[PDB]
From a paper:
The coronavirus main protease (Mpro, 3CLpro) is essential for viral polyproteins processing and maturation, therefore, it is recognized as an attractive drug target. Here we show both Boceprevir and GC376 can inhibit Mpro activity and SARS-CoV-2 in Vero cells. Additionally, the high-resolution crystal structures of SARS-CoV-2 Mpro complex with these two inhibitors are solved to figure out their mechanism of inhibition. Taken together, these data provide critical information for the optimization and design of more potent inhibitors against the emerging pathogen SARS-CoV-2.
In the beginning, we obtained soluble and pure Mpro protein of the SARS-CoV-2 with an extra glycine residue at the N-terminus (GMpro) after TEV cleavage by expression in E. coli cells. The crystal structures of GMpro-Boceprevir and GMpro-GC376 complexes at resolutions of 1.80 Å and 1.40 Å was also determined to evaluate the influences of the extra glycine at N terminal. The binding mode of GC376 with GMpro or Mpro has no obvious changes. In the Mpro-GC376 complex structure, the bisulfite group of GC376 was removed and GC376 created a covalent bond with Cys145 as aldehyde form in the complex structure. The glutamine surrogate ring of GC376 fits into the S1 pocket and has hydrogen bonding interactions with the carboxyl group of Glu166. The Leu of GC376 fits into S2 hydrophobic pocket, which is consists of residues Arg40, His41, Met49, Tyr54, and Asp187. Compared with transmissible gastroenteritis virus (TGEV) Mpro- GC376 complex, both the binding pocket and the configuration of GC376 are highly similar, suggesting a conserved interaction mode for GC376 against different coronaviruses.
Author numbering:
A (entry chain B): 3 to 306
B (entry chain A): 2 to 306
Write the structure that this text describes.
């Protein structure tokens, strides 16, 4: 079972660079709008506590350099929405895919197209942690790189990159510019909350193990959802929501193992450990595969 | 903790097509006016058990090949076989053909795979060519003709085309000249690989990545000679470390201030003592599928912990 990213071509065709002065970051070009982090308008001095409303009133369309490679796109309008800048340009991107902007929950996975100077560098899969941070590679110049999922022909953009926290983890916004988590776009030390294990994804991975015939951990017990949630919290596992129970439905149906029976199996693994045994060849419980990821990787779903 | 990163797949996505012969469907790679695909597309279920490919191919005409680029049929106007790959000349040039090369990769090197089904891209992930010439991929029925590649500037270097799954669940395939990596054959028979070994230079690169990310518990004050390291490495079915490998670890050694032979002494202790339930970069196992180049790409401008 490997992390698999979505094919990145539909997103590569949307990446541009945005420059104010000597500050360059990435933007997302959809139709005739370029979306990017608003801190492109900040200088070194502005960054500790920028007054973004005051910095933006001093900017005109002609102050923004938007480039698709070396090709300039003329800016014909600008506005700020939360922590994102929207630059209207005079050219509709002919590579614009069918798309949506979505706000994801903790535990949801997405692909990141890491970009520098508007040029795609790499693609990887990551998970939104319960503390609203992501673990992955973002270097200087990576801001405005996006996270996404693809369903059939349609790109759901869920993340735009803004900052690195002291622990080396990353924080950003949805494409409406609202941060995930209690973070703000200013050059100040900010701490993430204590992270927890993504319970719904551990359950998905136990279902994946059962599908592949690795089922030694199936016990003969059940639990209520409330009793499970109170025990899970003692082991720094996220409580399950009704939505989590429902998204496990397909794997529960495929395996014939009721969700609350799998919860009872996980509770015994937390209380007793694995006693030297492995699951899918791992001594560690994996929490960055969603129920969708398990079905996707076992069933060979494509996109176009 | 430290993630595998694939190359952006768009330049390859624009080359993927579907190839069908009778009821056998797989993927092809469309470059200029040629579609490259695994030759076993010409086999029925029965043929795949023990195929005489020259005999099976002479019984085929251009019209027996259905090539589809999405909805659009590409007319086949010529065919030839090069080792285990079929080359279908079509009457249309692919406008999305990138600058490209065909390369044969060395064991220990990494590449990105674009897994495809019915000519449609499904997923992208990083693989290493193992010393036993298998890859640990994710490939289902219909995945054959999926390719592996690296990208340098604008240029796609295609190194792998997918053909089969071994009984152990690992994967085997060819270069784009149709020559298998490893002692495998394109027949529906159970095939074992040679006993695999661990890619030593890649483990060392990953331990450097761990140190750069502040994960340092495994460092020690032993050093070793290269020869004495290699004696222990070989005992544990690790590949020998060459002076060329020591040289390519130079930049990571400079970044961390840990001499390559000091990192070798750390790895020797990990092999002899195990990890004792501890993790490195959140892994319970020593990872050998990042090259020094792969690590340098992610660690370049990182501030030392
Ligand atoms: C945007 O490209 C950049 C991304 C950071 C830089 C290093 N890795 C990243 O993920 N964001 C910032 O520089 C950001 C700007 C503020 C106005 C939000 N500040 C930030 O992340 O500060 C922490 C930091 C900066 C530079 C190097 C290491 C950490
Ligand atoms: C091409 O789409 C397909 C890919 C396989 C299917 C499952 N996962 C994969 O990677 N290749 C084959 O089906 C291949 C065709 C031969 C004519 C090369 N057969 C195959 O891999 O068989 C392996 C095997 C045969 C007999 C016993 C045990 C394993």
């Amino acid at each position: 079972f490997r992390k698999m990213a979505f094919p990145s071509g539909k997103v590569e065709g949307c990446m541009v660079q945005v420059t104010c002065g000597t500050t360059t970051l990435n933007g997302l070009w959809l139709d005739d709008v370029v979306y990017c982090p608003r801190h492109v308008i900040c200088t070194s001095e502005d960054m500790l506590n920028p007054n973004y409303e005051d910095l933006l009133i001093r900017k005109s369309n002609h102050n923004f350099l938007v480039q698709a490679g070396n090709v300039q796109l003329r800016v014909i309008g600008h506005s700020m929405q939360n922590c994102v800048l929207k630059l209207k340009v005079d050219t509709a991107n002919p590579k614009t895919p069918k798309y949506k902007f979505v706000r994801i929950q903790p535990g949801q996975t997405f692909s990141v197209l890491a970009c520098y100077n508007g040029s795609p560098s790499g693609v990887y899969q990551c998970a939104m942690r319960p503390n609203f941070t992501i673990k992955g590679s973002f270097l200087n110049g990576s801001c405005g790189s996006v996270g996404f999922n693809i369903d059939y022909d349609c790109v759901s953009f869920c993340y735009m990159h803004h900052m690195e926290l002291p622990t080396g983890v990353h924080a950003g916004t949805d494409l409406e510019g609202n941060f995930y988590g209690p973070f703000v776009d200013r050059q100040t030390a900010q701490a993430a909350g204590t992270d927890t294990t993504i319970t719904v994804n551990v359950l998905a991975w136990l279902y994946a193990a059962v599908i592949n015939g690795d089922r030694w951990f199936l016990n003969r017990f059940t639990t209520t959802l409330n009793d499970f949630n109170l025990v899970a919290m003692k082991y720094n596992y996220e409580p399950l929501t009704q939505d989590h129970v429902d998204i496990l439905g397909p794997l529960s149906a495929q395996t014939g193992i009721a969700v609350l029976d799998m919860c009872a199996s996980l509770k015994e693994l937390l209380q007793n450990g694995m006693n030297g045994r492995t699951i899918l060849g791992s001594a560690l419980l994996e929490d960055e595969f969603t129920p969708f990821d398990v079905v996707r990787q076992c069933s060979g779903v494509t996109f176009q």
